[PDB]
Amino acid sequence: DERVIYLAGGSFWGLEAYMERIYGVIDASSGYANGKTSSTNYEKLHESDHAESVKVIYDPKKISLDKLLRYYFKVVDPVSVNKQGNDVGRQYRTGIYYVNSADKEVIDHALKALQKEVKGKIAIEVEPLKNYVRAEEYHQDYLKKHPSGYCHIDLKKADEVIVDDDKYTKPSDEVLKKKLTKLQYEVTQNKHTEKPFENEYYNKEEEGIYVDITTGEPLFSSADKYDSGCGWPSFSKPINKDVVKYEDDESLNRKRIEVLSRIGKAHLGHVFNDGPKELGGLRYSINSAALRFIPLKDMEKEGYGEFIPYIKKGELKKYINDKK
C-alpha cells in the first residue's frame, strides 16, 4: 500500500516542493506537527509550539523510508537548533514524526549513519506524531503558485541519485579470480589499462547503466556518455558524487588522477580536464573491462529498477540539449 512520514526541516514551502520531486513520493503536503494544541494556524504557530512540517506520502515499493530520509538529510542543517538558513524559531526545528512503531528503528539507524559521517551532535528530534493540522490552502503547493517565492534549499538535489553503500559487496579475491577474465582482473585489481578502440564499450550508444564489474555498484549513466575520440568509454560525470574516488597516479612518468570505485576499490581509469565544455569539461576515461553494461530493458530483472527513471530522465535531457 502507501505509507506516510512527517518531516520538519525549516521552510515548508521549499521542503514541500523538494519532497514532491523525489521518485516514489505520491504526495507532499504542508502542515503543522507536534504542538501543544489539536488545531492552530500560521500566525498562532509561536504559541501552539507546532513545527512546520511536510506530510510525505510515498510508495514503499519505489522508495524506502531509509532512502527517503537520506534525501531529506540533504536539505537540512542536521546540527542546528531552531534555525534553518535565516529562519529562526521553534516552528523551524528539525524533526521526523512517525505514525508506525516499526518506523522508529529505521529513523534511529538513519540518524546514526548520518552522524557517523558528518559528525557533531544531531539536533533532529524523533517522536511519534501527536497532533497534526494541515496548513492553510494558501500554503499548499506554494512554490507552484509563486515560482519566485522564498526557497532556501536547492531543489536540484531532488534529482540526484542515491546509491546504497551496503547492498553491493566486493567478493573475495579468490572468487574474483574465477569470475573475471584475466584482463578484467588485471585492470580492476592491478591498474592495467585495456587497449583503446578494441574494447566492448567505447562506441556503445545505448540507454542504460554501467556498474562495477566486481561489485555491481552503479557508476555511470548512459546519459553522461559521449564520444571522446580516445577509444575508451568516456563519461562527463559519475552517476553521483559518491560512487567514485580519486587518487594521484605518478606511473608511466606522467602525473594523472586515477578514478576508483567506492565499494570495490576497483581501478576504473582516469579523469582529465579535456572533456567537452557544454557537459562540464571533465572526461572520465573508463576501461570497458571495469564495467558491466545493463540495458534499460534489463535493469529491472538485474536488480537496478530503482535507477530506471534516473537513466531515462538523464537521456531526455541529453536528447533536448542535442536540439540546440
Author numbering: 34 to 357
Q: Which sentences did the original study use to describe this structure?
A:
Methionine sulfoxide reductase (Msr) is a family of enzymes that reduces oxidized methionine and plays an important role in the survival of bacteria under oxidative stress conditions. MsrA is stereospecific for reducing L-methionine S-sulfoxide, whereas MsrB is stereospecific for the reduction of the R diastereomer. MsrA and MsrB exist in a fusion protein form (MsrAB) in some pathogenic bacteria, such as Helicobacter pylori (Hp), Streptococcus pneumoniae, and Treponema denticola. The catalytic activities of the MsrAB fusion protein are higher than those of the individual enzymes, MsrA and MsrB.
The crystal structure of HpMsrABC44S/C318S was solved at 2.2 Å and belonged to the P1 space group. There were two protomers (MolA and MolB) in the asymmetric unit. Each monomer of HpMsrABC44S/C318S had two catalytic domains, HpMsrA (34–192, residue number) and HpMsrB (206–357), which were linked by the linker region, iloop (193–205). To understand the fused form instead of the separated enzyme at the molecular level, we determined the crystal structure of HpMsrABC44S/C318S at 2.2 Å, which showed that a linker region (Hpiloop, 193–205) between two domains interacted with each HpMsrA or HpMsrB domain via three salt bridges (E193-K107, D197-R103, and K200-D339). Even though we co-crystallized an HpMsrAB mutant (C44S/C318S) protein with the substrate analog compound, dabsyl-Met-(R,S)-O, no analog compounds were found in the active sites of HpMsrA or HpMsrB. We found two acetate molecules in the active site pocket, which was used as the crystallization buffer (0.1 M sodium acetate). In the active site of the HpMsrA domain, the carboxyl group of the acetate ion interacted with Oδ1 of E85 (2.50 Å), OH of Y75 (2.60 Å), OH of Y125 (2.79 Å), and Oδ of S44 (2.93 Å). The interaction residues were as follows: the carboxyl group of the acetate ion interacted with Nε of H303 (2.69 Å), one water molecule (W4, 2.70 Å), and Oδ of C318S (2.67 Å). Therefore, both the active sites of HpMsrAB were reduced. In addition, we found that the linker region (Hpiloop) connecting HpMsrA and HpMsrB was mandatory for the higher catalytic efficiency of HpMsrAB based on biochemical and kinetic analyses.
